UniProtKB/TrEMBL annotation, chain B:
<dbReference type="InterPro" id="IPR001333">
    <property type="entry name" value="Peptidase_M32_Taq"/>
</dbReference>
<keyword id="KW-0645">Protease</keyword>
<keyword id="KW-0482">Metalloprotease</keyword>
<feature type="modified residue" description="Cysteine sulfenic acid (-SOH)">
    <location>
        <position position="35"/>
    </location>
</feature>
<protein>
    <recommendedName>
        <fullName>carboxypeptidase Taq</fullName>
        <ecNumber>3.4.17.19</ecNumber>
    </recommendedName>
</protein>
<dbReference type="Pfam" id="PF02074">
    <property type="entry name" value="Peptidase_M32"/>
</dbReference>
<dbReference type="GO" id="GO:0004181">
    <property type="term" value="F:metallocarboxypeptidase activity"/>
</dbReference>
<keyword id="KW-0378">Hydrolase</keyword>
<comment type="similarity">
    <text>Belongs to the peptidase M32 family.</text>
</comment>
<keyword id="KW-0479">Metal-binding</keyword>
<feature type="active site" description="Proton donor/acceptor">
    <location>
        <position position="267"/>
    </location>
</feature>
<keyword id="KW-0121">Carboxypeptidase</keyword>
<dbReference type="GO" id="GO:0006508">
    <property type="term" value="P:proteolysis"/>
</dbReference>
<dbReference type="GO" id="GO:0046914">
    <property type="term" value="F:transition metal ion binding"/>
</dbReference>
């Protein structure tokens, strides 16, 4: 009935309110909180997390969900989707026994300090005992989340971040990438080395106040609502807080402006999704949420990569760089394109350019999959990390675990099945932009970008993606939006056109 | 056994964790939140406030307190005090029916809107409907909070902010103030007028970045722990957030810097108490809270009035003004003292000098007491306000309710019985500083202030007040600290030395 469904709605509004507090508390801990407030803040967040957990895991919720589900056809369409999303949120908290949960929590908090130091010291052997336990915990986690579905443990884990994504499809997507991208990289490198184009590096200092002003200017170009969000400073840029009050951060160095500019553009792309997330009338409910991390990172990367690193945008950007920092030879649209699209393989994933980046992701996918499968053991990670690094990026890591397998925090913090979503995001972004250019026209999109007039583009994003939140399945959403399910051929054609053909 | 007590401790830690979130949300509301965030933020705070209420008022809590209390002798000194403070918190929440609390939140949220416009528009008539309801509400609230005590309803309201304070003691105190303050003010005005001393008002602009730097510098003089707190800007200066993370705010104008400086020093005096509140080991418990609004305001006024408006402090301050803003004729010791210590009765209590301030408080006390007692009704407040302002301050407010009875937010915000604590704080500050001067020596105290070297003074405040929180009754606390219960004669002699002599 409506009765139990509406009772669920009420419970989920309660949870949304408590989540508001947690999100604020988390935002503040990274931006405003002084160091001695840390224990108080963590104690407070833990207690509130506990209450949210007891609320969603009370016996009555399951009984409520079950009564609501027998009378499904008496609900409006969007209420039916909301009931689906409610079960999903309930299963995500309920399928892990509390004994497992506390054990995971203890190990991840342990695993963190052990990782951080070993990383800094290049000591995989000191990490390895922990790492073996993580991998056993993750394998155990997969099975629990798998439930009575018969899903592969890793699939159960990827599902946390990418609802409905199967290992079969993931293996097809990454196998597709593996068939062409390592040779594309090599082709691009040799083309760029044979050309020998002049690239003038921007010369600093770039005053941090002028960087901030430039960033806000670009947030205005993306029509960020500043009456419903903020820009501030943290050690790691992120997009956080709540949908009514979306708060992004960045970090500035005087020596360059690119990382921070492009970083803000990236987070603004996330923000636009959050600020415009529908469906309307479901604001405090789980159907009014981002569909997946791949869909979310598809929005950030649409902003950053599809618009931000384009030749057209350089035409708009260059004269703003003259205006905000003062003129210098580096500040021409042709030269800034060369700076922003420069291809240079390296060892560190977070520093990777648009082309190399998916190779870092692909390799993490394969290892994660293989560990979960039993094909390899923690023991072998360094060896296989090095194999893949030489193979995909032409670089060695043997003996350099610091910048090899120990470089990312993710496994310390109990995040397995997360990494692949980044390249899924890149693929979503390329697919969406292909559609937008098909619909609006190539010259129209280029004119919008080069003139910093994004409204027609942002409107298509809003229509196709943002207004739907989680009311549709990912497959349904992408089909409705772009004509088909997620297809990596768009990302391939984007990368070929931009890097191999220098087309923008 | 000790089981009920230790389970209550666990409950109050939970509540402390919840209050942390509410405190952060409230601070952020006034400092960082963009305007469209407002609805979601109010809905979140209300849901959490409800959960806290239901937690503390559950029948379980009553049963725990009753069980703990029947073996109160099996508890150590600080645990028995903590149990007293637990019962107090529970009674504060548990006494009003939930139907009452709903009505009040409704009425007050609406009252803030109508008050604000009526105030801007000088329209008591428009406000009078709301105000008759507020007064009816407060009389009902007082009776509810009194219960079977036999306390006057207004006493039960005063008790919320000033635990253990009786109306009889309040009447003894304001009666004392009335015995010397009027002849003092009168005398000071005719002294000032006969001298006709030159006062140079500082001339701006004062860049807000420079003001901020000066304000932070004085926070450092008070040894504010910036690893455990912040300064930020808000529409209305306050001291908030939590004890591990004390966040104070100010507002800046280019035309003058004094209000903001002294304001920051005031809030920093509050912050020092919150940053150092004991007892140690009871941090998440109600025993580790400020004793009263009177004692709290005592710490802020010790900072602001006892140190911050003294001649010795002007010796330190004047060279700092030159340093931060650049030299000008006004920036002398002698002249800044005259600016900061200036006496000029006016209509607006926030703007009142150290001498006139208690007169504004006394008139509100008298008016709140008469309203509660049914000696006047809401219709009569403008007339009575004028009469009391004429008698106390020499000033007519008739027809100017904007600068008369509608002046302050307190009544529309549901705060009755609050005003008296301002003067109690002034008295606590003066009594504290007496003991400090007696113990350290006048010369050592003056030396400390004039060199910006406040360590020895702060250490005394910490020892005497901050470290105890609510472990002692207010009478015990002041007796242990100062040798006696609150005595307004210290306040008298403070005002006499500063303004008459
Ligand atoms: Co992102
Ligand atoms: Co105060």
């Amino acid at each position: 009935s409506m009765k139990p469904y509406k009772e669920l709605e009420r419970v989920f509004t309660k949870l949304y309110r408590y989540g508001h507090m947690l999100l604020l508390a988390d935002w503040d801990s990274h931006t405003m909180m002084p160091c001695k407030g840390s224990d108080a803040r963590g104690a407070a967040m833990a207690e509130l997390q506990l209450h949210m957990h007891d609320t969603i895991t009370a016996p009555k919720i399951r009984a409520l969900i079950e009564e609501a589900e027998k009378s499904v056809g008496d609900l409006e369409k969007l209420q039916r989707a909301n009931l689906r999303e409610m079960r999903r949120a309930w299963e995500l908290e309920n399928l892990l026994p509390e004994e497992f949960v506390e054990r995971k929590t203890v190990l991840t908090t342990k695993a963190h300090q052990v990782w951080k130091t070993c990383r800094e010291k290049n000591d995989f052997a000191g990490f390895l005992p922990t790492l073996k336990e993580l991998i056993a915990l993750f394998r155990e986690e997969g099975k629990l989340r798998a439930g009575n579905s018969g899903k592969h443990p890793y699939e159960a884990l990827v599902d946390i971040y990418e609802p409905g994504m199967t290992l079969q499809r993931l293996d097809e997507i990454f196998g597709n990438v593996r068939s062409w991208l390592p040779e594309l990289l090599k082709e691009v490198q040799e083309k760029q080395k044979a050309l020998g184009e002049t690239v003038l590096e921007p010369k600093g200092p770039f005053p941090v106040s002028k960087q901030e002003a430039l960033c806000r200017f670009f947030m205005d170009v993306w029509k960020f609502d500043f009456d419903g969000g903020r820009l501030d400073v943290s050690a790691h840029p992120f997009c956080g807080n709540s949908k009514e009050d979306v708060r992004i951060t960045t970090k500035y160095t005087e020596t360059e402006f690119v990382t921070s500019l492009l970083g803000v553009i990236h987070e603004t792309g996330h923000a636009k999704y959050e600020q415009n997330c529908g469906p309307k009338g479901f604001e405090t409910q789980p159907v009014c949420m981002a569909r997946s991390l791949g869909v979310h990172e598809g929005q950030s990367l649409f902003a950053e990569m599809q618009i931000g690193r384009s030749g057209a945008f350089m035409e708009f950007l260059a004269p703003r760089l003259v205006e905000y920092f003062g003129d210098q030879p580096a500040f021409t649209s042709s030269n800034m394109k060369r700076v922003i699209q420069r291809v240079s393989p390296g060892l560190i994933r977070i520093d990777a350019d648009e082309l190399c980046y998916p190779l870092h992701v692909m390799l993490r996918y394969e290892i994660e999959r293989d560990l979960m499968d039993g094909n390899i053991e923690a023991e072998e990670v360094p060896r296989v990390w090095n194999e893949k690094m030489k193979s995909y990026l032409g670089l060695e890591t043997l003996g350099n675990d610091k910048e090899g397998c120990l470089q990312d925090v993710h496994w310390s913090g109990g995040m397995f099945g997360y990494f692949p979503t980044y390249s899924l995001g890149a693929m979503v972004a390329a697919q969406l932009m292909s559609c937008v250019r098909r619909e609006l026209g190539e010259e129209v999109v280029d004119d919008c970008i080069r003139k910093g007039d994004l409204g027609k583009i942002l409107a298509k994003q809003n229509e196709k993606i943002w207004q739907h939140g989680s009311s549709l399945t990912t497959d349904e959403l992408l089909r409705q939006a772009t004509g088909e399910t997620l297809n990596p051929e768009h990302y391939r054609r984007h990368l070929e056109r931009r890097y191999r053909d220098d087309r923008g």
